[PDB]
Amino acid sequence: KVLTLEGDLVLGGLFPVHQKGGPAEDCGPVNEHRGIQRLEAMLFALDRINRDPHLLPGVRLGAHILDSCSKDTHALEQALDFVRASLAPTAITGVIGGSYSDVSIQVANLLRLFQIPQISYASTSAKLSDKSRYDYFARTVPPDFFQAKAMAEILRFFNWTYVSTVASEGDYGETGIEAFELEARARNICVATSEKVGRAMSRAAFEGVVRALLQKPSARVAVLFTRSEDARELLAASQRLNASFTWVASDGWGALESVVAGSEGAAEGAITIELASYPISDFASYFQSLDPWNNSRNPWFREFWEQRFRCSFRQRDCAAHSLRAVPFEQESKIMFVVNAVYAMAHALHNMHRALCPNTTRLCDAMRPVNGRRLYKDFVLNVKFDAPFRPADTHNEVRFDRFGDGIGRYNIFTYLRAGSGRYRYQKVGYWAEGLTLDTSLIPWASPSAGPLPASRCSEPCLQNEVKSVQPGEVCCWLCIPCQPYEYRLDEFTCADCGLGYWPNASLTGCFELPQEYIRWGDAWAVGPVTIACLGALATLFVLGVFVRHNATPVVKASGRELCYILLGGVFLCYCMTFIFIAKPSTAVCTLRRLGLGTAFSVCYSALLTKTNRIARIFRFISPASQVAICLALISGQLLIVVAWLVVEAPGTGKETAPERREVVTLRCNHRDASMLGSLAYNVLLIALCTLYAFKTRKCPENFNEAKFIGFTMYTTCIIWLAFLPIFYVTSSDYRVQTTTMCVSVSLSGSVVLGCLFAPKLHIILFQ
Amino acid sequence: RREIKIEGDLVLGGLFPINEKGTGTEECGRINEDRGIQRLEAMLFAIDEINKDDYLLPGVKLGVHILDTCSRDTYALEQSLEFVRASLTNIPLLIAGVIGGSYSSVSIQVANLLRLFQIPQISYASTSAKLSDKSRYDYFARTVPPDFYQAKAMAEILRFFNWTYVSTVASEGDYGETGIEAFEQEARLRNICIATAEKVGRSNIRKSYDSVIRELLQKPNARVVVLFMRSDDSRELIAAASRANASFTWVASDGWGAQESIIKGSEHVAYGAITLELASQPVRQFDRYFQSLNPYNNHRNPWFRDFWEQKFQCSLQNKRNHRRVCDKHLAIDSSNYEQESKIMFVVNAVYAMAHALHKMQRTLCPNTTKLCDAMKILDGKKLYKDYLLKINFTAPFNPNKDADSIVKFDTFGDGMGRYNVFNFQNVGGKYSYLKVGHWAETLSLDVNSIHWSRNSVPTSQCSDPCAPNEMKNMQPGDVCCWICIPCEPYEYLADEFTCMDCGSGQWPTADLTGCYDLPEDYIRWEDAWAIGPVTIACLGFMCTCMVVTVFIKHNNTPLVKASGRELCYILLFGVGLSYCMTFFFIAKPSPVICALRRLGLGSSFAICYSALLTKTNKFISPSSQVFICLGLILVQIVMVSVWLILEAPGTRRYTLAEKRETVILKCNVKDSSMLISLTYDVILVILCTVYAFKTRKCPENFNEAKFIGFTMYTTCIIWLAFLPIFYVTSSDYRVQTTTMCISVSLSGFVVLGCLFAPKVHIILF
Ligand SMILES: Cn1cc(-c2cc(C(N)=O)nc3cc(CN4CCO[C@H](C(F)(F)F)C4)ccc23)cn1
Ligand SMILES: CC(C)CCC[C@@H](C)[C@H]1CC[C@H]2[C@@H]3CC=C4C[C@@H](O)CC[C@]4(C)[C@H]3CC[C@]12C
Ligand SMILES: CC(C)CCC[C@@H](C)[C@H]1CC[C@H]2[C@@H]3CC=C4C[C@@H](O)CC[C@]4(C)[C@H]3CC[C@]12C
Numbered sequence A: 001k002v003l004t005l006e007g008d009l010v011l012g013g014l015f016p017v018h019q020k021g022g023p024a025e026d027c028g029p030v031n032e033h034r035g036i037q038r039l040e041a042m043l044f045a046l047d048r049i050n051r052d053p054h055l056l057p058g059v060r061l062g063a064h065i066l067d068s069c070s071k072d073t074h075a076l077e078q079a080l081d082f083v084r085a086s087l088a089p090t091a092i093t094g095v096i097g098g099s100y101s102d103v104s105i106q107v108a109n110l111l112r113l114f115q116i117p118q119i120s121y122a123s124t125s126a127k128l129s130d131k132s133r134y135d136y137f138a139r140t141v142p143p144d145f146f147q148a149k150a151m152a153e154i155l156r157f158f159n160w161t162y163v164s165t166v167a168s169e170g171d172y173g174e175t176g177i178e179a180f181e182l183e184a185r186a187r188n189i190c191v192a193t194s195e196k197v198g199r200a201m202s203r204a205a206f207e208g209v210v211r212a213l214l215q216k217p218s219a220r221v222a223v224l225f226t227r228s229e230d231a232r233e234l235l236a237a238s239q240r241l242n243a244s245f246t247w248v249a250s251d252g253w254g255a256l257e258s259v260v261a262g263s264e265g266a267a268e269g270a271i272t273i274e275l276a277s278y279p280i281s282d283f284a285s286y287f288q289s290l291d292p293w294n295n296s297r298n299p300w301f302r303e304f305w306e307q308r309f310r311c312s313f314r315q316r317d318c319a320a321h322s323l324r325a326v327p328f329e330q331e332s333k334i335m336f337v338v339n340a341v342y343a344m345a346h347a348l349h350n351m352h353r354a355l356c357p358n359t360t361r362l363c364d365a366m367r368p369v370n371g372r373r374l375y376k377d378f379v380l381n382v383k384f385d386a387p388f389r390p391a392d393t394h395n396e397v398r399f400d401r402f403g404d405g406i407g408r409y410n411i412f413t414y415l416r417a418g419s420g421r422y423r424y425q426k427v428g429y430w431a432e433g434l435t436l437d438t439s440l441i442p443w444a445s446p447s448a449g450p451l452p453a454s455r456c457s458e459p460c461l462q463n464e465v466k467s468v469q470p471g472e473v474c475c476w477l478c479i480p481c482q483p484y485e486y487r488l489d490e491f492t493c494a495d496c497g498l499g500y501w502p503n504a505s506l507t508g509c510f511e512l513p514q515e516y517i518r519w520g521d522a523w524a525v526g527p528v529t530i531a532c533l534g535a536l537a538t539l540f541v542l543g544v545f546v547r548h549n550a551t552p553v554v555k556a557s558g559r560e561l562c563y564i565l566l567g568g569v570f571l572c573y574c575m576t577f578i579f580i581a582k583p584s585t586a587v588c589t590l591r592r593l594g595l596g597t598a599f600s601v602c603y604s605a606l607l608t609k610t611n612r613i614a615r616i617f618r619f620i621s622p623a624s625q626v627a628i629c630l631a632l633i634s635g636q637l638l639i640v641v642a643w644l645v646v647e648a649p650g651t652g653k654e655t656a657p658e659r660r661e662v663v664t665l666r667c668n669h670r671d672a673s674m675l676g677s678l679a680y681n682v683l684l685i686a687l688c689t690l691y692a693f694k695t696r697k698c699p700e701n702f703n704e705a706k707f708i709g710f711t712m713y714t715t716c717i718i719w720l721a722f723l724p725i726f727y728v729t730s731s732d733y734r735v736q737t738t739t740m741c742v743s744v745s746l747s748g749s750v751v752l753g754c755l756f757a758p759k760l761h762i763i764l765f766q
Numbered sequence B: 001r002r003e004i005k006i007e008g009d010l011v012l013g014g015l016f017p018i019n020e021k022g023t024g025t026e027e028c029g030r031i032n033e034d035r036g037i038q039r040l041e042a043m044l045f046a047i048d049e050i051n052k053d054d055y056l057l058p059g060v061k062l063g064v065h066i067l068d069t070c071s072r073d074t075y076a077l078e079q080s081l082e083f084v085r086a087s088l089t090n091i092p093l094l095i096a097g098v099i100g101g102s103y104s105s106v107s108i109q110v111a112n113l114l115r116l117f118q119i120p121q122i123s124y125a126s127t128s129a130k131l132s133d134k135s136r137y138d139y140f141a142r143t144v145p146p147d148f149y150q151a152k153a154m155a156e157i158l159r160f161f162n163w164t165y166v167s168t169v170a171s172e173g174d175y176g177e178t179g180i181e182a183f184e185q186e187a188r189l190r191n192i193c194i195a196t197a198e199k200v201g202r203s204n205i206r207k208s209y210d211s212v213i214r215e216l217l218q219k220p221n222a223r224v225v226v227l228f229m230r231s232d233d234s235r236e237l238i239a240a241a242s243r244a245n246a247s248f249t250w251v252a253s254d255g256w257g258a259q260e261s262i263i264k265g266s267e268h269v270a271y272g273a274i275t276l277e278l279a280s281q282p283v284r285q286f287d288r289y290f291q292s293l294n295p296y297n298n299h300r301n302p303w304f305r306d307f308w309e310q311k312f313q314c315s316l317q318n319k320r321n322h323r324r325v326c327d328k329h330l331a332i333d334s335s336n337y338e339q340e341s342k343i344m345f346v347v348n349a350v351y352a353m354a355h356a357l358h359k360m361q362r363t364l365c366p367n368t369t370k371l372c373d374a375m376k377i378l379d380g381k382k383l384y385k386d387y388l389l390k391i392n393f394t395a396p397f398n399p400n401k402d403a404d405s406i407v408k409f410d411t412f413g414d415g416m417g418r419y420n421v422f423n424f425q426n427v428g429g430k431y432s433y434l435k436v437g438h439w440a441e442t443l444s445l446d447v448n449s450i451h452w453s454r455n456s457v458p459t460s461q462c463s464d465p466c467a468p469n470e471m472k473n474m475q476p477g478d479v480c481c482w483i484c485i486p487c488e489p490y491e492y493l494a495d496e497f498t499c500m501d502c503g504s505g506q507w508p509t510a511d512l513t514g515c516y517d518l519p520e521d522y523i524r525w526e527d528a529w530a531i532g533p534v535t536i537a538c539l540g541f542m543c544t545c546m547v548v549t550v551f552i553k554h555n556n557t558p559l560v561k562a563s564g565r566e567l568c569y570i571l572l573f574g575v576g577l578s579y580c581m582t583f584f585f586i587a588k589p590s591p592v593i594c595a596l597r598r599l600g601l602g603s604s605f606a607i608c609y610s611a612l613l614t615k616t617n618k619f620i621s622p623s624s625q626v627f628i629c630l631g632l633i634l635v636q637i638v639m640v641s642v643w644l645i646l647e648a649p650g651t652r653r654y655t656l657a658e659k660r661e662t663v664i665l666k667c668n669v670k671d672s673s674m675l676i677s678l679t680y681d682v683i684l685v686i687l688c689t690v691y692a693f694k695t696r697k698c699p700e701n702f703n704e705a706k707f708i709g710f711t712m713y714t715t716c717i718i719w720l721a722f723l724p725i726f727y728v729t730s731s732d733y734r735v736q737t738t739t740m741c742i743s744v745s746l747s748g749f750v751v752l753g754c755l756f757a758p759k760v761h762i763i764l765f
């Protein structure tokens, strides 16, 4: 039985009119839903196309529909006629065959060598999408793995990340979950479990897989991509265990009462994906008005009439039976067949328009039909409104670059409040864009939660996030970083200068130091005022002595020695007042100079004055006493410059501890460096002690002779009190400076009382 | 439509390129005399020896269904539909197995067609790497290895002759495309590249082949070329090259090989070409069978009449339209007969199919040695899976028992790679192919090839090897060819592509990876020339010794009390630092001494002039005044520059040449600023001369005052003469600077002598 219609262009066709049948017969029982319902749809669409003024106005199309009873071998033998005729009916320009995963594969493999374009209407296999093996194959139905994009978009819209994926044994579940994971990666979505619900297993295996899915509470959403029976069994197993989930269904479980019946409690907010199909207002009317007598075009219509009504033509009893009275249920894959045949017609019209301009009929250049150009350039680039539309938004009939037609999916949600069960409600659609309506979804309404499945938790702040992921990168588990350090990157928290606080609030890792100079008034106002008062008093005393330095200088110690004493005490007071300064190398070196030099000169002048008395008890040499004192000071200055060049003076970055407020008060000078000179001042103190032990007293300077011992004792006491203080206050900075200033002021006051006070008393007496 | 159909229990198919475009315009007008007819006769000889064989298929006759292909994949697909005509269910004949085509594209197409119908296929000459894929070519097999081993052999021979930069051209068919990519991979593995790559197709030689030849001639630097292109295109390419007078050394694949039909009348362009052909042992039985063939007894081959007409120009039974009538006394003798290399491959394929069929018959009919009803329907899938891919038998006609005798099938239904190396040569005036190598997984080329110019043709002359000491890579036009221009003028060039400068004060090493900083010229300057000022320093030491002598009279109660005791010692202090000043300048320019250098020069010069001015002008005020100006000058310079510039010597003064590093960088800047200080220092010195030049003339020291004026007069002239030499100081950092400071030392020594001259005069008198 071969269906042939007269026409200028003949279109091929392969439909499963008969079933697989037994081993004895190649073709068994006649299929009245998938082989004759689609065949009549193709015939009706061809007739309407031939009666369309805007679609091939002059050229009338024909048909060469064949039968493949769900057998790959039989389909191959039938399709061999298509390639044999081209090399005797009209050459088959296009084939609208292909209704099975393997039949379409065989037809495409056979027809690719002879370059015959083919658009399938019911083949959802993903293996045909590989164009490296199937060059001239197309299809109107979207492939099964195209729902992965819709699933990922839905999960991203609901902010679901820690999802669970369930696959199948066949090419349906596998080839979907493969590249469903890939689409999940592009959406920042991780897969928690990859259990495979495949072949037939006992209820124990179903309980095991549902237990493995439920073993972690972080994954409250599962993505089922299995067949209807597998989904039904999984729902039954979940209901038996009484688990709660938000299963994201697929085309296997879409708007089906045989998959959710008996498991209403388990599934209450499951997202269901179903392919969108619209009824045809004219195909049903055409199908009712059909009889086996007038409709002699279909050779298999007699068998359909005999089997459907359980009658036969030998008794002449089938006349009473009618098809209009019997209710008609349009198959889902009828609009797809209509779209496929209309796409072939549109491609032929484009060929005629862009190849035979001057001829409205079949031009001569169209006689040697070539499938390569006709397929590649035109079939994959057709864009026309879907025929017989219900005036919806499904007017997009296009083919991708991989020969896969676009598809629109209806996102159903299983409601249960309206009627208890069987309330599949459409809450959106997927047509090149997600259009979910959260108002109809119960848990999306503002009276519940999104029932989320978040990978661990992300409550961490921007400055206190480490993103340390033990096993799940999507978890973004954070560990609190050091409070004294900022972060280098959001994904990886790195300590940026943990010693001092950086600009964490500014997102930068640059440190922010605080210049806490030793200027605090609490520990400075007193000592600074005391030092200033002492310096002013010393300057006034020196000026008063200098003004009347005529009679007393010659009688008392030499004027040069008195000037040396005045300069020494003035330098000591100046150093005490200037000890506080910014942490700079210049301030450090000036302090290192003065602190030693002033003391050294002030005691060297006293020693030289005692040396004059010692000489009385080489030569006295009044003019050389100043030179000797200057040499004594210069020796200490040489020691100071040596310990200043060998020490490499500098300014410390900060005197603050490892973790505390930033402060910079330390200097490059060390305790050993200080003691290096302190040995020389200890030698000077010993010399002064020996001079005091030389107790011979001049009648004019009787008080001064004993005052030398008092000065030596005061200096010894100050040193013996400062050394334990220096050891204790080594870490302290403000206390050490105050103690040093107090000691310097005390030494200056002692020297002033030793030297100027008798002079002031003598001046007042005179 | 012409075919050879023989009835029998089992029928073996056949696809040969009998018809091919030779000298004409038709796509397959001419007849192949070496590729199609020879292989067809080899298959017929194998079949009719198997039919009479007793140890192989006893009692079963093997038929043939040999067809034509016209060297086209579409024609092969159209004509191969008769192999599946009997499987539907000019009488259909059931084909047990099909012998594969001679071309990679044809074999691929027939394999794709026969995979659906489950018909085993064994090829004899389809060497393609695109095949052997068990995902799209399930029902396919071949006795020949793929193009991978051929590409490896080509890379090996190219590396053997040091051929690096070559020109490449291939075909657009399924054979050229994959083989050329394999060649690119195997060439980039061995660090050799190609000039350009061209793809040709089955078309007229006016445009495509002419453009290819012109482009190849456009780059004379590359002489050796490779040919991953089919024989039918190879003949036309050779003809075009001969028309254009080509001068390249072709490296051919198995497509051309040792075929003499490609080159006929154009042997001067293919001279010296190195062609690759599969190793094969000639069959003496096939040679005798072909030599015994006659036009009359060979009624089985429809194409034999055309083959005889093309081989010998005469009419077998036609009229006198041809240029001669056949003499009826000539045959295919050894003088003009050359057995094709790929004949034992066809024989092995036919015998392997026969062995598989015989073993399947034995295992399916153990009781009787005859075809049974169970074997009436043939399962090609099972046959190919087990009884064809797992066959092991000795070669049908081989007097040896070596490795090549055993015929096996790999996991992919492949063969072993032993491509022979053939070189076109002219010996005795007769052009012929001579074997010069054998690729038994190791290249064994012998030095016997006769090249085009009687010498080893060189290549890669555009990019010759160069020493990396100064050369750099530059690729203006092509990535491969580079010019080794001399770069890096005393700079590091670790990167071969680009050369960049080390920078100031850096000298590259021999490795050109790390620039080394040369030692400073100023440092360690005490050996040859800086010892000059050391003698001045020794003279300064003598001046210091003189400074020791001058105060001896002043220490021992000098009689002349008119001169101030404090003033006399004050001026001696100034001259003392001047002698000690030159030591710092000639010492190591350490950061500590740079600050001390300016202090030493500034303070000593100021106090020396200040003391003289105070002496010229009771005695308390001159002492205080001298210290006042000396203290003010010392204090002012402290807070002006040294406390602000923060002098720190470093590498500098390298702009003139990279082989020079001055140890002072910030200190050198202070030296430039010292010129302003020097003018300021001499400003007060010059002012002092005018202020007290024969103005006071105190009678107590009139001679001393007049002498003191002379000291001021000679100092300004000496100081002024120092200015011109300070400008050229920067030219010689370690030479001029040392001599520049000698002027101050010389002035100090002169000042001491004249100032103390009246004092020493009294001592002498
Ligand atoms: C009678 N009397 C002498 C002085 C005196 C004098 C001098 C001096 N070289 O002219 N330098 C002093 C340094 C210091 C600091 N110390 C603290 C840190 O550690 C070190 C040590 F020695 F304390 F361990 C140093 C303290 C007192 C110094 C003051 N009063
Ligand atoms: C270490 C330092 C600070 C010590 C003091 C250095 C300076 C200020 C000293 C050293 C020698 C001193 C001079 C020595 C002698 C005299 C003579 C007298 O009739 C007046 C003061 C006068 C002119 C002194 C002034 C101050 C002086 C110049
Ligand atoms: C070296 C560093 C500290 C810079 C200071 C250099 C000058 C100013 C110093 C260094 C050594 C010093 C001398 C050391 C010893 C004596 C001997 C004495 O009977 C008179 C003073 C005299 C002659 C000093 C004068 C000043 C002096 C020359």
Ligand SMILES: CC(C)CCC[C@@H](C)[C@H]1CC[C@H]2[C@@H]3CC=C4C[C@@H](O)CC[C@]4(C)[C@H]3CC[C@]12C
Pocket: A641, A642, A645, B580, B590, B592, B593
């Ligand atoms: C001694 C009197 C008469 C003259 C004055 C001499 C003075 C200027 C000399 C004597 C010893 C010298 C020091 C000897 C060694 C060093 C260490 C070196 O790394 C830096 C310079 C330095 C620190 C010298 C500075 C100048 C110096 C202090």
Ligand SMILES: CC(C)CCC[C@@H](C)[C@H]1CC[C@H]2[C@@H]3CC=C4C[C@@H](O)CC[C@]4(C)[C@H]3CC[C@]12C
Pocket: A623, A626, A627, A630, A633, A634, A637, B565, B566, B567, B569, B570, B573
């Ligand atoms: C400050 C120290 C360390 C270095 C510099 C030392 C200088 C200032 C010293 C060294 C020798 C000193 C001189 C030594 C002797 C006399 C004679 C006296 O009747 C007046 C002061 C006078 C003229 C001194 C002036 C100051 C002097 C020049």
Ligand SMILES: CC(C)CCC[C@@H](C)[C@H]1CC[C@H]2[C@@H]3CC=C4C[C@@H](O)CC[C@]4(C)[C@H]3CC[C@]12C
Pocket: A621, A623, A624, A627, B544, B547, B548, B551, B555, B569, B572, B573, B574, B575, B576, B577, B580
């Ligand atoms: C060479 C440089 C550093 C210094 C130049 C000036 C020198 C030579 C001067 C300056 C100060 C002078 C000293 C001042 C005072 C005295 C004390 C007297 O009882 C003996 C001489 C003596 C010890 C002098 C020796 C010479 C002296 C050291």
Ligand SMILES: CC(C)CCC[C@@H](C)[C@H]1CC[C@H]2[C@@H]3CC=C4C[C@@H](O)CC[C@]4(C)[C@H]3CC[C@]12C
Pocket: B544, B580, B583, B584, B587, B588, B590, B593
């Ligand atoms: C008593 C008289 C002769 C003393 C004269 C001062 C002498 C001892 C001083 C004056 C200048 C000094 C030099 C100044 C600078 C340097 C560079 C340093 O890297 C090593 C020490 C060295 C080389 C010093 C050695 C001592 C020195 C020569």
Ligand SMILES: CC(C)CCC[C@@H](C)[C@H]1CC[C@H]2[C@@H]3CC=C4C[C@@H](O)CC[C@]4(C)[C@H]3CC[C@]12C
Pocket: A585, A589, A637, A641, A644, A645, A648, A649, B591, B592, B595, B596, B599, B647, B648
């Ligand atoms: C007696 C008097 C005149 C001596 C004065 C000596 C002065 C000018 C010398 C002695 C040691 C010197 C310091 C030694 C080392 C350094 C570190 C260097 O990175 C900057 C300069 C600096 C900080 C020098 C500045 C000048 C300095 C302080």
Ligand SMILES: CC(C)CCC[C@@H](C)[C@H]1CC[C@H]2[C@@H]3CC=C4C[C@@H](O)CC[C@]4(C)[C@H]3CC[C@]12C
Pocket: B577, B580, B581, B596, B599, B600, B601, B603, B627, B628, B630, B631, B634, B635
């Ligand atoms: C030659 C090199 C080492 C530089 C030496 C610089 C020395 C000699 C300079 C630098 C600063 C000077 C001092 C600056 C100020 C005064 C105060 C004045 O009332 C007496 C002289 C006196 C005390 C100077 C003595 C000489 C001095 C110490």
Ligand SMILES: CC(C)CCC[C@@H](C)[C@H]1CC[C@H]2[C@@H]3CC=C4C[C@@H](O)CC[C@]4(C)[C@H]3CC[C@]12C
Pocket: A585, A586, A589, A590, A593, A597, A598, B595, B638, B642, B643, B644, B646
């Ligand atoms: C006579 C005795 C007692 C005191 C002499 C004080 C002299 C030596 C002091 C006074 C001012 C000081 C200078 C002040 C500031 C700086 C800048 C700093 O970056 C290096 C040290 C340097 C250049 C100091 C060197 C020593 C200095 C010249």
Ligand SMILES: *[C@@H]1O[C@H](CO)[C@@H](O)[C@H](O)[C@H]1NC(C)=O
Pocket: A157, A158, A159, A450
């Ligand atoms: C998902 O999260 C985004 C914020 O990242 C929010 O704007 C959106 O409303 C969320 N979707 C829901 C709650 O369905």
Ligand SMILES: *[C@@H]1O[C@H](CO)[C@@H](O)[C@H](O)[C@H]1NC(C)=O
Pocket: B160, B161, B162, B456
């Ligand atoms: C190739 O070059 C090498 C040196 O790099 C040389 O030893 C060898 O003989 C050359 N091969 C030839 C000239 O065939």
Ligand SMILES: N[C@@H](CCC(=O)O)C(=O)O
Pocket: B035, B102, B103, B104, B105, B125, B126, B127, B128, B175, B230, B231, B254, B255, B342
């Ligand atoms: N092996 C080459 C040609 C073999 C031949 O026919 O000589 C191919 O696959 O096209």
